[PDB]
């Protein structure tokens, strides 16, 4: 019957009163059950559930809405916060009474649940309301801006709130994010955009970036706390960049990085490298005005003064790499971009002085006599720093030179020590630097083997020193100036030579007189033991012959290049070693014999690259590039017949880089010289594509 | 007076290299040509 | 097994104990336990849910034959005999158990 | 015929600790030293009450965590000691 269910309608909705306002009895449960039960049974459980909804309304409306306008003046919140509690308690008993039709007719009807339906409700005439909701936003905004001003506030009110807007957003969280969630992030923004602007005033980038790290926690915090994690995630990104990013470059020129660089502050340098690590291209930014301080720093110790100390030249780079070698040590935290940054600034620079190599060759000074680990140390960042030079070929010319120097005076503090560094080119260069090295090496072995094998002979038949030098491995003069020996010498040179061809056929001996010394005596008042060119040895000779010697009539009797005569003017130096003019060498100049020179000890060594020498030494690296690449290309070229020029050129720099970068447009003109020299054949279809011709 | 004594002569040995073959290995060496029977 | 064993001692108190609410389905008085019935959901809201929690309770609606398997169910988890099913079924609407619902069903698809 | 049974009661239980956080239906009172709420019914079951069954009733307020807890769901092992569970012996031994 349909007067039946109303009823009994009339009589569980009036219950439903009950169950809804504070007051919750008078009644026996089991008859409200029947009542629903009975309902959706008659298929009058959808009506209960529409009659359920319109009450649940009207107490959301005329129980509420008034009850929290009442406390618009104050405690607004608190009373909407008390509504809420009240509303989801009359929803959960109420539900717990009309289960059955959330049991059957709810799911049936594919409606919501009764809780579900009154939190709806509820965010649809209270929360989330036309006026309501903007009361509760602004009094929340107002609630955090007091706490981020740090006007203790009740933390609890703005999560209770915060949190009764999740719960209304039941499976999502729309409601929160278009109440609170959204106007604070904005009112947070522009909070942080004036903290930034108040900051501007400072303009101290150390307290800037202490403070700004602090207002991350602080703020961070303010949310975990009672804004929850939904609007925490965005400030992370807000906060960072109404901050940070709209200073990414002012706050490394404001104290500042430079400043941070100028002073060492590694930990000063090391908050800035954190506050931009968070950064997007934060680091970047950090990364180029370093590099452009490095830039600066390492060219004004790269541009010569004079001409500077090549040991200063190379020990000042070295300091300056250990710098900010520590920087990225601590501050930079080994970061690889950092790293990356320094060496390339470094490979730049340092190029830019084409004496690099030959001021490194620094090695030779550490070489020619600290502890042994604290050398290694040295000549290991010598070695970072040729890394970065590109002219390696060029360093290891000048270093073998200085080398074959120290082996032919056997004065290196242990070959040992060679042998590491000759090692360490080995790990940084080709194996025929390192045959070149080594061959001077067995050259050497077979120098003292030989020499006794003489001197075993000299006893066999019954003080010549000849020191025999392998061809190629060691650099000689083009042209040995062939000067006349004095005879004793001579003569046992001569055994030398005779006895080096018995021993060794097939091998000569073009003796390189202008290298080597000998305990030359000399009259001094009693004589002395000088060290002297075998130029100068001849040239006192010349004396023995007559005392007074003049300039040019020494060379017409000692056969000695003019300029190599040097001799002279370092003989008279400065007349205590010998008279000539004090030091000016000139053919007007004539020498006497000196005796004024003398010394504490018997043995006295007499004094015996320039603009010339560097000149003749870089045209020689500049030749042997230039054939170097046009074996290089031939080579390639005959491996595989069809080469494209710009494939060709670029196989064959990418391969010689190693050693030099060749210069492409001087490539072409090798180039077009191998296409001359058959090899390269321009195809018809690409000129640029060469055939091999063998 | 100046009677040269302990003389260190210096003479650079030379041929009196790897052949164009090896040039183009080291542990091959040298009608005497540089790595069945002799030419 | 510590939930089984406490469920096999909560009905126990079979020692005509704690059985401090008493249903009336049809005027009979049967005994049961209040707060036991709590934890299974027509008893669930008769008490804690029950606003007049002064259910200490009369049922009406089924018969006690279904609400004796209801019963005999909600303790030791044992239902449903082939004169006692569609009844229970009924009650099984009452009281807010699907299984009751699901067996009778079955039994109902067997028989 | 097939009396189909199903033992998901282990929400009964689930339900007892429920009706617990409810902090509703609390039978009795534990006085720990402080009151704390218990229900007698999960308390008899759990450990042999004697004490509440046994009429030692005229005590509303009886007067005294870890057990509690696991019942619903160094001073331990003492308690377990003076009342003998076995499930509890087993915990505190190997904790």
Same mark, same amino acid.
């Given at each position: ?97 009309? &289960? ?40 929340? *905004? ?21 949190? &009764? ?21 904005? &009112? ?251 061959? &001077? ?59 080096? *061809? ?68 370092? *003989? ?83 391969? *010689? ?38 | ?39 | ?44 809201? #008769? ?19 279904? #609400? ?7 303790? /030791? ?10 009844? /229970? ?19 109902? #698809?067997?028989?």
């Amino acid at each position: 019957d349909e007067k039946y269910v109303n009823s009994i309608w009339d009589l569980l909705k009036n219950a439903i009163q009950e169950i809804q306002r504070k007051n919750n009895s008078g009644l026996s449960f089991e008859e409200l059950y029947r009542n629903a039960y009975t309902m959706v049974l008659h298929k009058h459980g959808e009506k209960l559930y529409t009659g359920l909804r319109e009450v649940v309304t009207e107490h959301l409306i005329n129980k509420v809405r008034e009850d929290v306008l009442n406390s618009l003046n104050n405690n607004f919140l608190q009373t909407l916060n008390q509504a809420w509690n009240d509303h989801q308690t009359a929803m959960v008993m109420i539900r717990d009474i009309l &289960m059955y039709m959330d049991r059957v007719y709810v799911q049936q009807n594919n409606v919501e649940n009764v809780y579900n339906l009154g939190l709806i409700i509820f965010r649809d005439q209270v929360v989330r309301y036309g006026c309501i909701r903007d009361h509760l936003r602004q009094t929340l *905004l107002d609630m955090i801006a007091r706490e981020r001003k740090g006007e203790v506030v009740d933390r609890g009110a703005i999560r209770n709130a915060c949190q &009764m807007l999740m719960i209304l957003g039941l499976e999502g969280r729309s409601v929160y994010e278009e109440d609170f969630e959204a106007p604070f992030l904005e &009112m947070s923004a522009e909070f942080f955009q004036m903290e930034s602007q108040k900051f501007l005033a400072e303009n101290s980038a150390s307290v800037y970036i202490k403070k700004v790290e602090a207002r991350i926690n602080e703020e961070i915090e303010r949310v975990m706390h009672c804004l929850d994690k939904s609007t925490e995630e965005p400030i992370v990104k807000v906060v960072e960049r109404e901050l940070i990013s709209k200073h990414m470059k002012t706050i490394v020129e404001m104290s500042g990085l430079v400043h941070m660089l100028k002073n060492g502050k590694t930990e000063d340098l090391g908050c800035m490298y954190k506050l931009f690590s968070r950064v997007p291209n934060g680091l970047k930014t950090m990364c180029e005005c370093m590099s452009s301080y490095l830039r600066e720093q390492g060219k004004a110790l790269v541009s010569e003064e004079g001409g500077k100390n090549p040991v200063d030249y190379i020990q000042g780079l070295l300091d300056l790499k250990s710098r900010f070698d520590r920087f990225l040590l601590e501050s930079f935290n080994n970061d690889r971009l950092f790293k990356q940054t320094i060496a390339g600034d470094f490979e730049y620079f340092l190029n830019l002085n084409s004496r690099s190599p030959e001021y490194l060759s620094f090695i030779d000074d550490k070489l020619k006599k600290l502890t042994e680990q604290e050398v290694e140390t040295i000549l290991d960042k010598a070695m970072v720093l040729f890394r970065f030079m590109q002219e390696k070929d060029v360093f290891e010319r000048y270093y073998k030179q200085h080398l074959a120097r120290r082996l032919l005076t056997n004065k290196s503090v242990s070959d040992d020590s060679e042998k590491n560094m000759i090692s360490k080119l080995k790990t940084e260069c080709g194996c025929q630097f390192t045959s070149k090295l080594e061959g &001077m090496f067995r050259d050497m072995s077979i120098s003292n083997t030989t020499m006794d094998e003489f001197r075993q002979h000299l006893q066999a038949t019954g003080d010549l020193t000849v020191r025999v030098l392998t061809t190629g491995y060691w650099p000689t003069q083009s042209a040995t100036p062939k000067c006349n020996i004095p005879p004793a010498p001579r003569h046992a040179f001569e055994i030398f030579r005779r006895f080096y *061809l018995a021993k060794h056929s097939g091998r000569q001996l073009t003796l390189q007189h202008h290298m080597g010394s000998a305990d030359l005596n000399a009259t001094f008042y009693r004589k002395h033991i000088l060290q002297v060119s075998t130029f100068q040895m001849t040239i006192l000779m010349l004396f023995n012959n007559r005392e007074k010697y003049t300039f040019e009539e020494i060379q017409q009797e000692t056969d000695i290049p003019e300029r190599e005569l040097r001799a002279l003017q370092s *003989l008279a130096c400065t007349q205590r070693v010998l008279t000539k003019k004090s030091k000016e060498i000139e053919n007007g100049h004539i020498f006497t014999v000196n005796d004024q020179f003398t010394s504490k000890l018997h043995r006295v060594k007499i004094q015996t690259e320039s603009d010339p020498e560097r000149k003749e030494t870089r045209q020689k690296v500049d030749d042997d590039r230039k054939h170097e690449i046009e074996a290089a290309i031939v080579r390639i070229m005959k491996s595989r017949k069809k080469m494209q020029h710009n494939v060709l050129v670029a196989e064959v720099t990418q391969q *010689l880089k190693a050693r030099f970068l060749p210069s492409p447009v001087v490539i072409k003109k090798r180039i077009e010289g191998l296409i001359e020299r058959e090899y390269l054949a321009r195809t018809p279809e690409d000129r640029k594509v060469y055939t091999y011709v063998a | 007076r100046f009677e040269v004594k302990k003389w260190n002569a210096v003479a650079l040995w030379a041929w009196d290299d790897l052949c164009i073959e090896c040039q183009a290995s080291e542990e091959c060496t040298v009608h005497a040509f540089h790595f069945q029977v002799c030419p | 097994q510590h939930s089984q064993a406490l469920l096999r001692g909560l009905l126990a108190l079979d020692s005509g104990i704690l059985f401090d609410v008493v249903l009336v389905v049809e005027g009979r008085h049967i005994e049961a336990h209040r707060i036991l019935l709590a934890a299974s959901d027509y008893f669930r809201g #008769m008490f804690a849910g029950g606003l007049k929690m002064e259910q200490e309770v009369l049922i009406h609606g089924v018969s006690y034959n279904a #609400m004796c398997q209801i019963l005999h169910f909600i303790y /030791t988890s044992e239902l449903l005999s082939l004169s006692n099913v569609q009844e /229970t079924l009924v009650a099984a609407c009452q009281l807010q158990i699907p299984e009751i619902i699901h067996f009778c069903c079955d039994f109902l #698809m067997s028989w």
